[PDB]
Design a protein around this ligand. Structure first.
Ligand SMILES: CCCCCCCCCCCCCCCCCC(=O)OC[C@H](COP(=O)([O-])OCC(O)COP(=O)([O-])OC[C@@H](COC(=O)CCCCCCCCCCCCCCCCC)OC(=O)CCCCCCCCCCCCCCCCC)OC(=O)CCCCCCCCCCCCCCCCC
Ligand SMILES: CCCCCCCCCCCCCCCCCC(=O)OC[C@H](COP(=O)([O-])OCC[N+](C)(C)C)OC(=O)CCCCCCCCCCCCCCCCC
Ligand code: SF4
Ligand code: SF4
Ligand SMILES: [Zn+2]
Lengths: 95, 49, 45, 96, 115, 179, 176, 115, 209
């Protein structure tokens, strides 16, 4: 960090960049390991007012696969609209 | 200047490790020659830094 | 108490650099050839 | 506390005891039969009996979130002192 | 149209320098091979619904650059490739002949999960 | 960590800060890779124009992810079918233009940088709220609620012994793994 | 959106080709690598001095299992039998029995370390936080037998690491 | 019900016809596999063993089933001759490590309470 | 969503997929026995065993389908069905970002002609469906074993095959070679009967039978 400005210069010149700005190790910037106790929130449906499970029945509300054709003028369609050719990244088009 | 200071801590490391005996002890026993502040000591001799 | 959880700072974290910073360095191609030849005739001389 | 078998063989709290021959004992040879000295049964029996003057007392076990699911054991039985199932420590009502 | 595209952006795929008429004489071909198929066939009505219809602008509009969004089919150099599979596919169900009833009804209630 | 219905636990306090420090310094570490390898001739000649595959065979071979993208194939699950939050985030898919090994290597290192974009966007846009769904029938109740509320005990009980019953049916759910 | 990664336009001016010839003849990009690794050497290492210093861990760490007990000292375990029912490897085996007091706990809590996979589901399963799994990871051995932990072994280990795990769940139960 | 698909053979006659030459291949290979796999068994016990697994299923009448073991048995002779399998993979057929299992009623009764 | 717990639905894709279901249905009334679009916008094409080439070749080259990506093909061994196996292909369309599932029934002996010609990704995708399940695929380049051990016997993914199998290995020092024996576990699998006796979601309840 410890390292004197002399060989800091050697790292900076040989690498072509300044490394003291950011290093692969860690230092005092790390949050200390005794973080205060949290107060995690409550559920959106935690209210004791109208909260009947008859409303939210995620497992129950599922329905069998809908019957549309079974063994027992017209138009041509597609399963979805054809894809849209996305444009180049405005930030950086060509690497 | 800086090289002198880097040399200067080195003898300070010898002073920190109880002179020569501690320095030879820790380097042959822990491969560590760096001294830090005392933080605690259990009922075992496990000296912490 | 008031809800507490790991949240970003109110202004948000600092910008994250992500570009390639490959270092545009060194000398011109002619300069290397000029200097490369330059040290030569010194040797022969 | 912990007792000792005829073969020494300190008997654990459950009551395990290898009998005289019991060839399986040979695994403890040259080794130690790991037994926990602290026995739960007699390490809670000597605990002081709580004296709370109410019919129903919660038994969270200290540190409600950190303890055990809070029960509402009844305190009307005067023959014996009603205890929480999970806690095991005993509640008794002083003269009800 | 415009200057010929150097590469289509997909390796293996090559840029065809005469794409508009290549789409033309391909698109006629599916219309030709569709002639063998019966009129009642569900294939044919769908075929002609998108074959000569999409033969429309390529016959009318000659700029492939505008033809990209005429068919919403991506780059023309793979549209003619896609037309090739349609010509290929037309030959396939010239043999499958799928408009007959089912070969076999599903044996008992094999479907209808769960069991 | 990723359980049906969300995540098991919360991030510890300050965890986003440390990963923010990590995020800042990692762009440099990517530069180490590219400086080490990208322009190195020995790296290129062992990699460029090697193992090339055309777009049609690559797609017909059932390939996926970077395998298609390296051959210039215009496809990405996070973009075309954005699952989870991936729709509310911007990133550039690194489509190659040769299909050989080198094109993928550039695509992958670009995926690193674009991944770093996601970390920053998710960092500045981490919303508050609960960790799991508010449905004890599929999400085990909070430990605090476990020991005070009877419904939680039953829901926690049957969930850890029997487990939630998933309605019958079938589903092939697809996500773009880094592989 | 998207971006190309290898569309390269090598300019064919006499200037640029000189660099390309300079690049090939004088191993400039190779020298870039040499100076790159040299800068790495001139940096410090990050090799932690084990066992004189170990890796950074977290209070939520999952390690070796250890059955705990109440502040009174009676075993938290009540043989609800949840943990083995969720145990994804069926490493937990247990049989409850009547006890003399009537607080009928288990005579068997045997967790096979060579079958268990340290998911931590047992902790979440236990309603009384009886089975937690401690921060220790040094519990290696030389014979396969000593990894078949039994009720006594867990109880002893719980009494050993009791000083540590008590604070760990103290600083983490709010998250849970 | 009775009418069914010929996976490879219509009739039991051509089922053996597929068994025959496959046995010929499963007869010819023995000297070379015993040589390069570096075993200790003799060729002849290899020969009569080949008979042994040709025997246990020599009792089926369905043409599909028998020729399914034909392809099933077709699937190891190359797994052997291209040294794909191991010495442990063909001594496995030479069941050797187990003690002889009990045959008489007395022997089962003595060993345990299991038919 | 006014109910954040429940997953929102999308009818826009739902009936569009339903429209495409009828589309393919009318083209091949000889093959498509059953078409079904589920709640979660998933399309199913139930086909006859003979149709593995045509409908997949149709789904691969058609202008309105363009499903050229073989996501996967898998079997679902259902003992109670007369056709135990159920080979389930999955198709992905780059042009329409959709997914198509096709199912074919099979017994142990009835073969499926290989779909290698349609999807050449399927080359390796039968070498294990033959291994795990035992459904043989006709006219296919190679039917070798790549998941089961060399010379392993059986089809483990069959629901009648035990979890532990039949053979367990051990290095026998008598012969200096690992060898197989009938399996005998240190502990048997403590199977759990966790199916509640009270009926689940009545939506998919079976009709009075
Ligand atoms: C080759 C160059 C000449 C020899 C090395 C010169 C040298 O180390 O100079 C000090 C110093 C060390 O630089 P470094 O090589 O970057 O190490 C930097 C550490 O961060 C320094 O940071 P620190 O403050 O943590 O340094 C503490 C360090 C201080 O260490 C020193 O001062 C090194 C000299 C030995 C003591 O002491 C220890 O680490 C104790 C253990 C020593 C182990 C034995 C070392 C043997 C050295 C060679 C002996 C002869 C062969 O020199 C400089 O900073 C500039 C470069 C050299 C300039 C002097 C002229 C040449
Ligand atoms: C203590 C030790 C100190 C010295 C350590 C070694 C120094 C030299 C190697 C590290 C170089 C670090 C990178 C650098 O500066 O690159 C500059 C630049 C970086 O170039 P570039 O890749 O940015 O390209 C720019 C130039 N064109 C476009 C024309 C290619 O490289 C050079 O100048 C090359 C120098 C080395 C030449 C090697 C061949 C001749 C060898 C003769 C015998 C010796
Ligand atoms: S962590 Fe607990 S529940 Fe999970 S496998 Fe191990 S013992 Fe079983
Ligand atoms: S340790 Fe906990 S989960 Fe396991 S049986 Fe005992 S009380 Fe139940
Ligand atoms: Zn209690």
């Amino acid at each position: 960090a410890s390292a004197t400005r002399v060989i800091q210069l050697l790292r900076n010149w040989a690498s072509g960049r300044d490394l003291q700005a950011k290093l692969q190790l860690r230092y005092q910037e790390i949050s200390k390991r005794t973080q205060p106790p949290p107060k995690l929130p409550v559920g959106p449906s935690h209210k004791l007012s109208n909260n009947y499970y008859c409303t939210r029945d995620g497992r129950r509300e599922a329905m069998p696969p809908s019957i549309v054709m079974s063994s027992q003028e017209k138009k041509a369609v597609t399963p979805a609209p054809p894809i849209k050719r996305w444009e180049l990244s405005k930030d950086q088009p060509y690497l | 200047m800086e090289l002198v200071q880097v040399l200067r801590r080195g003898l300070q490391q010898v002073s920190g490790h109880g002179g020569l005996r501690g320095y030879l002890r820790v380097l042959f026993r822990a491969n560590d020659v760096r001294v830090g502040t005392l933080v605690g000591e259990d009922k075992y001799g496990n000296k912490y830094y | 108490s008031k809800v507490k959880q790991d949240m970003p700072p109110p202004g948000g974290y600092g910008p994250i650099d992500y570009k390639r910073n490959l270092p545009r360095r060194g000398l011109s191609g002619y300069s290397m050839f000029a200097v490369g030849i330059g040290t030569l005739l010194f040797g022969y001389w | 506390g912990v007792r000792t078998s005829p073969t020494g063989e300190k008997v654990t709290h459950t009551g395990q005891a290898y009998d005289d021959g019991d060839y399986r004992r040979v695994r403890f040879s040259d080794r130690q039969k790991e037994v926990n000295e602290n026995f739960a049964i007699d390490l809670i029996a000597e605990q002081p009996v709580s004296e709370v003057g109410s019919r129903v007392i919660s038994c969270d076990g200290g540190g409600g979130a950190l303890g055990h699911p809070r029960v509402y054991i009844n305190l009307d039985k005067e023959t014996k002192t009603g205890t929480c199932g999970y806690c095991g420590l005993q509640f008794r009502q002083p003269h009800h | 149209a415009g200057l010929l595209k150097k590469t289509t952006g997909l390796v293996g795929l090559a840029v065809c320098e005469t794409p508009h008429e290549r789409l033309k004489i391909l698109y006629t071909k599916i219309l030709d091979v569709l002639g063998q198929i019966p009129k009642n066939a569900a294939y044919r009505k769908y075929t002609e619904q998108i074959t000569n219809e999409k033969l429309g602008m390529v016959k009318a509009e000659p700029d492939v650059k505008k033809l990209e969004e005429q068919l919403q089919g991506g780059q023309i150099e793979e549209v003619i490739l896609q037309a090739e599979n349609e010509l290929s596919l037309a030959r396939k169900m010239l043999r499958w002949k799928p408009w007959e009833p089912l070969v076999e009804e599903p044996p008992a209630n094999q479907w209808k999960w769960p069991i | 960590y990723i359980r049906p219905g969300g995540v098991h636990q919360d991030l510890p306090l300050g965890l986003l800060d440390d990963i923010y420090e990590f995020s800042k310094n990692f762009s440099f570490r990517i530069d180490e890779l590219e400086e080490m390898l990208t322009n190195n001739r020995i790296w290129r000649n062992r990699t460029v124009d090697i193992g090339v595959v055309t777009a049609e065979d690559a797609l017909n071979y059932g390939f996926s992810g970077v395998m298609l993208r390296g051959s210039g194939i215009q496809w990405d699950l996070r973009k075309t079918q954005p699952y989870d939050v991936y729709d509310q985030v911007e990133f550039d898919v690194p489509i190659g233009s040769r299909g050989d090994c080198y094109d993928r290597y550039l695509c992958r290192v670009e995926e690193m940088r674009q991944s770093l974009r996601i970390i920053s966007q998710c960092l500045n846009k981490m919303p508050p709220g609960e960790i799991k769904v508010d449905d004890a029938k599929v999400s085990p109740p909070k430990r605090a609620e476990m020991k005070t509320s009877m419904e939680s005990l039953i829901h926690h009980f049957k969930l850890y012994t029997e487990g939630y019953q998933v309605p019958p049916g079938a589903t092939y759910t697809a996500i773009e793994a880094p592989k | 959106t998207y971006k190309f990664v290898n569309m390269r336009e090598p300019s064919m001016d006499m200037k640029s080709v000189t660099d390309r010839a300079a690049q090939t003849l004088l191993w400039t990009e190779l020298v870039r690598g040499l100076g790159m690794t040299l800068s790495y050497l001139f940096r410090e290492p990050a090799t932690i001095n084990y066992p004189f210093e170990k890796g950074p861990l977290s209070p939520r760490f999952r390690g070796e299992h250890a059955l705990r007990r109440y502040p009174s000292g009676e075993e938290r375990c009540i043989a609800c039998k949840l943990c083995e029912a969720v145990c994804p490897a069926q490493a937990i085996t247990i049989e409850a029995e009547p006890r003399a007091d009537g607080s009928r706990r288990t005579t068997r809590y045997d967790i096979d370390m060579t079958k268990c996979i340290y998911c931590g589901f047992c902790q979440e399963a236990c309603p009384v936080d009886a089975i937690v799994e401690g921060p220790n990871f040094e519990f290696s051995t030389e014979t396969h037998e000593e990894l078949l932990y039994n009720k006594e072994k867990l109880l002893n280990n719980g009494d050993k690491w009791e000083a540590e795990i008590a604070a760990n769940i103290q600083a983490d139960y709010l998250y849970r | 019900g009775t009418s069914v698909k010929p996976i490879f053979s219509r009739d039991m006659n051509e089922a053996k016809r597929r068994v025959r030459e496959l046995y010929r291949a499963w007869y010819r290979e023995v000297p070379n596999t015993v040589h390069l796999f570096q075993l200790d068994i003799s060729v002849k016990q290899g020969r009569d063993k080949v008979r042994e697994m040709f025997m246990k299923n020599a009792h089926v009448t369905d043409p599909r089933v028998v020729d399914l073991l034909v392809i099933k048995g077709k699937m190891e002779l190359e797994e052997t001759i291209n040294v794909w399998k191991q010495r442990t993979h063909i001594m496995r057929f030479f069941h050797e490590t187990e003690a002889p299992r009990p045959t008489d009623f007395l022997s089962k009764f003595y060993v345990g309470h299991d038919p | 969503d006014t109910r954040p717990t429940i997953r929102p639905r999308n009818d826009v894709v739902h009936k569009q997929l339903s429209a495409f279901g009828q589309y393919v249905a009318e083209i091949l009334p000889k093959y498509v026995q059953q078409v079904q679009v589920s709640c979660f916008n998933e399309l199913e094409i139930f086909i006859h065993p003979d149709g593995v080439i045509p409908v997949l070749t149709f789904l691969r080259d058609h202008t309105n389908a363009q499903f050229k990506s073989l996501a996967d093909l898998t079997a679902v061994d259902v003992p109670t069905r007369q056709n135990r196996f159920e080979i389930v292909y999955n198709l992905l369309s780059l042009r329409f970002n959709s997914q198509i599932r096709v199912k074919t029934y099979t017994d142990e002996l009835t073969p499926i002609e290989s779909s290698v010609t349609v999807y050449k990704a399927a080359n390796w995708y039968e070498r294990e469906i033959w291994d795990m399940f035992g459904v043989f695929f006709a006219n296919h380049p190679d039917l070798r074993r790549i998941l089961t051990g060399y010379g392993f016997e059986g089809h483990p993914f069959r629901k009648d095959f035990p979890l532990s199998g039949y053979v367990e290995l051990r290095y026998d020092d008598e012969v200096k070679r690992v060898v197989a024996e009938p399996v005998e576990l240190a502990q048997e699998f403590r199977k759990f009967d966790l199916n509640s006796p009270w009926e689940a979601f009545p939506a998919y309840r079976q009709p009075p039978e």
